[PDB]
Amino acid sequence: AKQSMKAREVKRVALADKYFAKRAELKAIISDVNASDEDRWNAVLKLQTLPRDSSPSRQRNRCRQTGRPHGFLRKFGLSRIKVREAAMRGEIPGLKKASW
Amino acid sequence: GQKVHPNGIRLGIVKPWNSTWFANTKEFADNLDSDFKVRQYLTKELAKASVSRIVIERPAKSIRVTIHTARPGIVIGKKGEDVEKLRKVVADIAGVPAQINIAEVRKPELDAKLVADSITSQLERRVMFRRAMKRAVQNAMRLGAKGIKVEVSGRLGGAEIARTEWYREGRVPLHTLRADIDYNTSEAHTTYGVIGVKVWIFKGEILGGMAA
RNA sequence: GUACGGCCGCAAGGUUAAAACUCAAAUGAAUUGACGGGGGCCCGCACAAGCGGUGGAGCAUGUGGUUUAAUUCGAUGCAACGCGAAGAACCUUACCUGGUCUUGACAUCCACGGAAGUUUUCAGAGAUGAGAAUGUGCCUUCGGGAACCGUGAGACAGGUGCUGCAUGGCUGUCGUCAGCUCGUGUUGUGAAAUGUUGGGUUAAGUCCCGCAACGAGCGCAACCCUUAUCCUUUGUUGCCAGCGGUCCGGCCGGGAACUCAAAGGAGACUGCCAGUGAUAAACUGGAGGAAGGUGGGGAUGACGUCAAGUCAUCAUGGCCCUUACGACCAGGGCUACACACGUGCUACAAUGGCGCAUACAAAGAGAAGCGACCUCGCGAGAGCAAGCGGACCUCAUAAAGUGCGUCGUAGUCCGGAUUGGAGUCUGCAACUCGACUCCAUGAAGUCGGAAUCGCUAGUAAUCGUGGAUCAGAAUGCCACGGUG
RNA sequence: AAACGACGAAAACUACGCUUUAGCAGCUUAAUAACCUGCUUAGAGCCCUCUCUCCCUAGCCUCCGCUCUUAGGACGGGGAUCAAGAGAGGUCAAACCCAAAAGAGAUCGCGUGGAAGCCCUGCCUGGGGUUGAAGCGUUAAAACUUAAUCAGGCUAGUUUGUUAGUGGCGUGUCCGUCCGCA
Ligand SMILES: [Mg+2]
Ligand SMILES: [Mg+2]
Ligand SMILES: [Mg+2]
Ligand SMILES: [Mg+2]
Ligand SMILES: [Mg+2]
């Protein structure tokens, strides 16, 4: 839960949610073979000097409440230690200890 | 660190939940954070009125917060407008339209939090810790309860060594899966440090489980 | 019980028997714990019995040491060492190297000014400096307001820095082992004892009897979750018992007997007959029964022990740094190494590999998604791309099995690692550092000392599939069924 | 190496308190009693807050969003005060709570048939596309249509290719007869 690391992660979202269209169209163009070599090279050179830390696959999924950089779960958006205390208190509509 | 948390095992038998709306793997982290924020704001806004439980619901993109307290006079205020005034701020916090409900408890000394409260207050105002403990025990026993186990950890009576002490009157089962075990925990802040207060309350045998 | 003194005795010594000086104790009977190289009984794959494995050999992360700039933090006998880490190319993650800073990257605050803002121009790898093209988004009395930027400090930040010998919370072990206590009464002047002990019995302080014990709490079981026979309800995306057309496909016409789907129940309780046992509890057979003695599996971990482990999820009383331990991004290193170790995958070849018909599972995940086809590629997958928050579509012709052939005991048509090159998935970028692919060299190894570990039934052992982490990167982790 | 035990016998909100009534329970031979208790309700003592008993008005409402307007009901608007009684409650209000509207009906927003810019086209002529830029129309309509017309001074003869003077710091700081770009 470091304050220094808690701002870079939100920057990596507030900047990656803005370049969605340009990056999508560039990926489509450079992925479709029906293009021109000079245009593709210019596009990739323009893409690479875009801010580095704004890439979608350049941020580790950080926990919501405590920001633990390991064990992040898609279902709850929380780490194991916090989902334990959440499901134990009973705030998760349906989380009961189980037995198959 | 030895006993299992009783609420997490009594969730699916008798004890109701505190959040049971419907989300799909996308907004529950946000819903959980909103619930935590509204609860922590409610605690700070009603630190004087004895408040025990807060339940949340989300029917059709709208948030409902139900508070179970014993002093609704402070929260209601004169002319019955402070409830709406704070509903405004909780709606602002939650974003989606909000509504609140009050479930004032008659004779609430059997509530875990409200029976673990005001003893923290006596310890803060330096009333004798043994007097506070025996008063809490007698107050929890006089209302017809069948057993209260409250655990006190850390500097009993503003001491200098974090010790472990616990009283037990009546019977307080922990392995029976039909016994209503109301459990909670609170903390007391004093000039010498912090003290922990954990309370289990055995209501009695409840057969049939849910659906009354 | 010593010296002197008297007596006795050959002697050894015996007998009578002090004083000076030191201390506030020296003791005996009994009780509770503890301990014994004291004893007895009982229990658990604890031994035995078995069956498979680990030390022998590629490889994988992990551990100690070494090197290194760092080889990022802790875990250190069971109870750390495929641990946190449910997946380190940069980002990452706290370590290292160069450069920018100062109420700072991120928190409330005043004096005001600009709507916030979108595209590009440039110097620098970058850290962030200059700036232009621009926009004036909704609103009170226009000594303007919310929102967002900008500056000036001071009211403030920040710390994955340490202290788990201040702690909360959490977790593991003893240990699902069976004990740990209390109320009253009784006994002994009393500390204390009884209950809790003793025989049967059990998984048990489980049940019975006797006994100054009688009861109660935490406790052992049950109440909680699935499986095993049967009942009813609802019949779609499923079934075709019977009937019909039929493109031979359940396609529908139909239906709710069934398998399946989720809701409520009957149901195994020593209930029985016989023996044993104390005319008990119980144990053993047998009968019914789908199941029999707890019917079969899982959570639930009793008072307490280990200054047990984490101030590195988090919070946290004190020290602490306040122009740097706070903070800035790029490149490296966490992945390295003459070594030793825990664990596992991979093989030793005739029950075994090579290929060609061919078969039966459960449960799962799916919209920045799951992703049928088709055109292709010896192969990875490329292009085009239907359907689907899904009893509808995908992942996903599962294998072991089976019938054939084939090889013939050989470093092997075994074993699949190292090597040069080739593309592919993937994320801005795979020299450090991914995985997949297939052509090519085709290592080691041929059941492995002392030791040593796991299992008592649908379990060992084998075969494949599924799930979470995540741009991809599982021999690790968690589950699922088949054989047996 | 350490570890004492003293005073809710200095009940710390009254939850309005304050009064009182039946039973229960801890107490023990069985009971009572204090209260040790909570616990169903009774009534008013006693401070109370709100809607009231005042009058005026017939207000009044609700499906269509507006309307004279329709069975109807629990429906109900302003002004000073309260004499004594009555409902609730206790620093009490949203939701929980109890059942709703009959029709007419302009229809404003909401969708227009001949045209102003963007399509060869960077100034601008394009009817071949179009917008509320023009007739118009109810809970809806008298349908209707942002792309494909060749080509112009269309960045303007010197910017595309011959080529020429000095309205140039040219060159290691350089004055330097000169090499070389316009
Ligand atoms: Mg403290
Ligand atoms: Mg002598
Ligand atoms: Mg015995
Ligand atoms: Mg039987
Ligand atoms: Mg990733």
UniProtKB/Swiss-Prot annotation, chain A:
Short name of any one Pfam family annotated for the protein: Ribosomal_S14
Name the GO terms of the biological process aspect: cytoplasmic translation; ribosomal small subunit assembly; translation
Keywords attached to this Swiss-Prot or TrEMBL record, sorted alphabetically, are:
Ribonucleoprotein, Ribosomal protein
**Keyword NAD among UniProt keywords:** no
The molecular function terms in GO held by this entry are:
rRNA binding; structural constituent of ribosome; tRNA binding
Gene Ontology cellular component list:
cytoplasm; cytosolic small ribosomal subunit; small ribosomal subunit
Which family is this sequence assigned to?
A: Belongs to the universal ribosomal protein uS14 family.
> Which function does this protein serve?
Binds 16S rRNA, required for the assembly of 30S particles and may also be responsible for determining the conformation of the 16S rRNA at the A site.
Q: Which NCBIfam families match?
A: PRK08881.1 (NF006477)
Q: Tell me, how does this one assemble?
A: Part of the 30S ribosomal subunit. Contacts proteins S3 and S10.
Protein name listed in UniProt: Small ribosomal subunit protein uS14
Native organism: Escherichia coli (strain K12)
Swiss-Prot record, chain B:
Q: Does the keyword Signal apply?
A: no
Annotated KH type-2 domain ranges read: 38-106
Record key words, sorted: Ribonucleoprotein, Ribosomal protein, RNA-binding, rRNA-binding
Recorded hits in PROSITE patterns, A to Z, give: KH_TYPE_2 (PS50823), RIBOSOMAL_S3 (PS00548)
Organism superkingdom = Bacteria
Answer whether the UniProt record assigns the keyword Ribonucleoprotein to this protein: yes
Q: Which CDD domains match?
A: KH-II_30S_S3 (cd02412)
Q: Which GO terms describe its molecular function?
A: mRNA binding; rRNA binding; structural constituent of ribosome
Quote the cellular component terms of the Gene Ontology held in the record: cytoplasm; cytosol; cytosolic small ribosomal subunit
Q: How does it assemble?
A: Part of the 30S ribosomal subunit. Forms a tight complex with proteins uS10 and uS14. With proteins uS4 and uS5 encircles the mRNA as it enters the ribosome, which may play a role in mRNA helicase processivity. Some nascent polypeptide chains are able to cross-link to this protein in situ. In collided ribosomes contacts ribosome rescue factor SmrB.
Provide the function of this protein: Binds the lower part of the 30S subunit head. Binds mRNA in the 70S ribosome, positioning it for translation.
Q: Which NCBIfam families match?
A: rpsC_bact
The entry's family comment says:
Belongs to the universal ribosomal protein uS3 family.
Q: Write down what this protein is called.
A: Small ribosomal subunit protein uS3
